[PDB]
Nucleic acid binder design. Sequence first.
DNA 1: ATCAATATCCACCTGCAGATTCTACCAAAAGTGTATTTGGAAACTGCTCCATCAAAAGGCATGTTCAGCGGAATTCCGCTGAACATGCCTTTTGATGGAGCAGTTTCCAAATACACTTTTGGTAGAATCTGCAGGTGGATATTGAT
DNA 2: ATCAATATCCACCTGCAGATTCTACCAAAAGTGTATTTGGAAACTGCTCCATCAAAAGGCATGTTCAGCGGAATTCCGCTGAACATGCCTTTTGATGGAGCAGTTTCCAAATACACTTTTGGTAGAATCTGCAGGTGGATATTGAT
Lengths: 100, 105, 74, 86, 95, 86, 92, 90
Amino acid sequence: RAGLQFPVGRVHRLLRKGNYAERVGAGAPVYLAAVLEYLTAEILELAGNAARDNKKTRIIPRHLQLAVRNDEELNKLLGRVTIAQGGVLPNIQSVLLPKK
Amino acid sequence: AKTRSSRAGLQFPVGRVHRLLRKGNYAERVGAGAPVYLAAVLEYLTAEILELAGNAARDNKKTRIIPRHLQLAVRNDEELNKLLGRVTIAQGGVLPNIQSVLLPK
Amino acid sequence: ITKPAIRRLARRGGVKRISGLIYEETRGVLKVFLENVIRDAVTYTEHAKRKTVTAMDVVYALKRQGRTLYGFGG
Amino acid sequence: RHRKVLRDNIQGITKPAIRRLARRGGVKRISGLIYEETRGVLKVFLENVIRDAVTYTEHAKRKTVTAMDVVYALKRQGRTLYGFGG
Amino acid sequence: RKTRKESYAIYVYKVLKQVHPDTGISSKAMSIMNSFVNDVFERIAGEASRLAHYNKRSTITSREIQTAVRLLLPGELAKHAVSEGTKAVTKYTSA
Amino acid sequence: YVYKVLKQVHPDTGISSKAMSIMNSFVNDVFERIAGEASRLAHYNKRSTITSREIQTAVRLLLPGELAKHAVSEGTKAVTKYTSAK
Amino acid sequence: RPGTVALREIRRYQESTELLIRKLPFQRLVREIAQDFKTDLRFQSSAVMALQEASEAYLVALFEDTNLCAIHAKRVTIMPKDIQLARRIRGE
Amino acid sequence: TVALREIRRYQESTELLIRKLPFQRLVREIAQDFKTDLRFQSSAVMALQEASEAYLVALFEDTNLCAIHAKRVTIMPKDIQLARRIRGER
DNA sequence: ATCAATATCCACCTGCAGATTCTACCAAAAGTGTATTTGGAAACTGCTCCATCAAAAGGCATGTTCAGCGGAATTCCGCTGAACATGCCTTTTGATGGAGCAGTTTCCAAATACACTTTTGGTAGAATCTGCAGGTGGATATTGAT
DNA sequence: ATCAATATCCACCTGCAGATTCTACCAAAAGTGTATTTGGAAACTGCTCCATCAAAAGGCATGTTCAGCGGAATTCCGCTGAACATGCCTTTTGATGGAGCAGTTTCCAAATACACTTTTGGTAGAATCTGCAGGTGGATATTGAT
C-alpha cells in the first residue's frame, strides 16, 4: 500500500523489537523498507547482468561478488563485508606481466 | 538509607549507572546486578589508568596529571593500548620513538 | 595447512613469486587469526550455555572483529 | 553587509608545519613532493569529517557546528576523540 | 513443534523479478542477500538510534532514517535511496 | 568519582581539567561499548533482560586478557557483596 | 618457465571460488585451537565452513597487500617482512 | 643531525603543529562548500585540528615504515599512497 | 684525539592562570515500601545433525636441475636542507553587537495500549522439473627450443 | 622464422543435485477499531558565546645560496625458488548410533509501575590557594673540524 514489495509491517515490528528507541513513528518503517528494497534491487540488477555476461540464468555468489566489487559505491558500502564463495576480481599487477 | 554504591563497596555511582542503562535503550529490562557489575568494572579501569598516569606524572617531576601523562600511560601499556587502539587523546602527543636505521654512525 | 594450499591462496591474491619462509609466516598469521575469532565464538557459545559452536556464534564473532561475513545466517 | 571570499586556504599548512608533523611521526628525510600530497590527504580527511559533522548539525536544525557534532562525526568513522566533550 | 524462521527471501525474489524476470537465484545466493538486508537494516537503525539519542528524542521517525541513510550510504546510493524513501512515505500518507 | 579513585591510588596527585575531561570521555566510551555488547548479546539469545551475566560476557569479549580477568573479579565481587546486604 | 607457470595459476585460481585449504586439515586445526578455550566442544558443520571462508578470504586479501609491499620494494618475491609491514600498517 | 634533533624535540612536546588561524579557515572554507551560513563553536574547530594532526602524524609513521621498507630514508608520495592503500582508505 | 661551537640538561625562582575550597539553593536523583506482572531457569523429551568409521579417490611430498632474481659494490647527478636575512601575518589582549542556542510553558497530532478478526509467511512431505557442471572432441593459440 | 609440446577454447551432451510447483495445517502476524496518553513542535525569550574590528609585535614563514650525500642506474653472479615427473599417504565420500540442540510446560525469584521521603551532586559566584610555565644562567654533553 506504500507501493512496495518489502514488508512494512515486519520492518516496523523489527524496528521496535530491536530496542532502537522508545517509540517508532509510522513513517519510519515505510521509509526504511523502501530503502532496503531499493538497495536490494540495485544489487540484483547488477548481479543479474553479471550472470548474463557469463551465459547463466541463475545468480550465484560469484555473481554477487563481481557486481559488488565492480561498482565503486556498492564496493564502498560493503568494504568490510565478505561474501562467501564469491572469489576475487581477475587482476594481475602490471609489473608482474611478461616482459614481452 | 544507605546508597547502593556503599552496599556494593563501590566509589562509582551504581544508581546513575543503572539509570544510564535504562535510558540508553539497551534492553527492555535491566537486572539489579548489571549496574553493580558495570560500575565495578568502570571503577577498575579508571583506577588502572590513573595508577599508570600518576606514575608518568611522577617520572616527569609533576604533581598534576595532564593529557600527556594519560597518553604515556596508555601507549606504554600493551592492553590499555589495545583497548584504546582507535582512540585519540587530545594533547597527548606521541611516545618518543626513532626507527633504528635512522640513527647516525 | 600445506605449502601447496598456502601457495594457492597466494595465487588468488595475485602473487607471482614466493619466498621459502613465507609458508611458516602464513601459518603463524592464520593461527593468530583463528585464535582471535574462535575465542569470541566460544565465548558466545558458553554464554548461551551450549557445547556446540554454531555458525551464528562464528558470524557474530567475525562481525565485531570487523570481518562481517555474508551467507551463514544473519 | 559582510563577507570576504575564502579561497586557497589549503596553502596554510606551512610546509614546515608539514615538516613538523612528519618529525612527530618520526620522519627523518622528506621528498619535495610530500607537501602537495599531504595537503591533498588533509583535504580529503577534513571533507569526510566536516561532511558528517555538518550532517549532524542540520539534523538538529542548528546553524552552529558543535564540538559534539565533530566528536560524533569522528566516532562514526572510527577516529574516536577524547577530551572535547565526552 | 514449530521453531520457525522469518527471512527477507520472498521479497528479494519478488524484487529480483521486476528487475530481471527471466533470472533465477541459487540458495546460497539468497542467503547472501538475506545477510545483506539484515546488515543494512541494522546499520541504518543503529545510526538512527544514535541520532535520536544525540538529540534527546524518544522517537525514531522517517527523518532519522533519512539522516541515517545520508550518513551511511555513499554519495549516490544516498541520493536515490532518499528519493525512494520519500516517495514511499508520500505514497503512504496520501492514501 | 574519578577524583575519589585518584586519591585512593595517588593521594598526593591532582588532575588538570583537560585530563579530567579525557577521563570522562573514557568512562562514557567504555560504558557504551560494554552496554552495546551486552545489548546484542541479549538479542542474540532472545533475552529481554540485561543481567550481570551479559555484562560479564560483554567484558570478556571487549577487554584484553589481563584486564578482563581483573575486571571480572571486581565485578563478581561487587555483585556478591551487594547481594549479601540484607 | 619459473614464474610463467605461476602466471597461469593466478589466472586459474582468482577465477575459481572453491576453497584452497583442504577441509579435514582445517577442521583439525579449528578444533585444536578451540580445545584451548573450552574442552569437549562440538562444531556445527556450517560453523567450520564459515571459519574456513573467512580465514581464506582474510589470507587472500593479506597476500594482495603483501604483494604491493614486495613490488613497492622492486621485488617479485613476497617475503615475511612484506607480510609484517602489511599487518603493522593494518594495525594488526 | 638536525632532523634527529627535531624528531626528538617534537616527539615529546604535545602542542599543535599547524598555525591555528590558517587551519581554521579551511575548516570554514571546506565547510562552506558543503553548506553556507554555518557558524563554528571554537571548540569544534579545535577538535578538528586535534583529530587532523593525530591522523597526519600516525600517517607519517606508516609512511616512514614504507620508505624504510624500500631501503630509503626520504619519504615520497608513493610511500604515503602505499600506506593509505593498505589502510583500506585506498 | 684534543678543540671549538652549540645544543641539551636541570635545578632554582616567582608571577599567575587554572584549580581546590566553600556557603547556599535544589531540581533532579536515588532510596524505601507495598502491589502486580512475568521473564527465563529448570526438568523432561523428540528429532537433528554431529562425531566416528571404513572404503574409494586424488592431491601432495620429494630430489634433481637451473633460470634468473635481487643484493653487493660502484658511480655521480641533482635534490634536500642547513644557515641566514628579511619582514609578514599569526597571535594575543580587549571589547561589542547580536545571532542563535537553549530554558519554559502550552497543547494536539501522533504514538502507545489492549481487544478482536482476518491473512499469511514458514514448515513438512511428495512429485516433478531443469540449469549447468563436468566430460569429449577437435580446433587453434601460446610458449619454448632452434 | 620453423616445428613440437601443451594449454586453452568452444560447441555439444546429459545426469542430477538443487530449484520449482501444488497441497494442507496453523501459530504468529499484521490489519482494524476504540480509548488514553504524551513527545516534542511552536511561540516567547533569557543569555551565552560566536563573528568581527582594532592594534601591536615578535614568532615563524619565505626565499636564496650552496654543499652534503642519498638513491637510482648499472654491472656482476651466488644460490634460492620453481618446474617436473614418481609413489602413496591423507583427505574425501557416504553410512550410522547418540549427544545435545531445541520445543514445551511449569511457577517463583525478580523486574515493572506507582507514591513518597530524603540524600546529593550540580552550580552560580565571591575568595583564597598553589603547581608550574617560562625567563635565566651555568654545568654537561654532543657535534663537527682537523
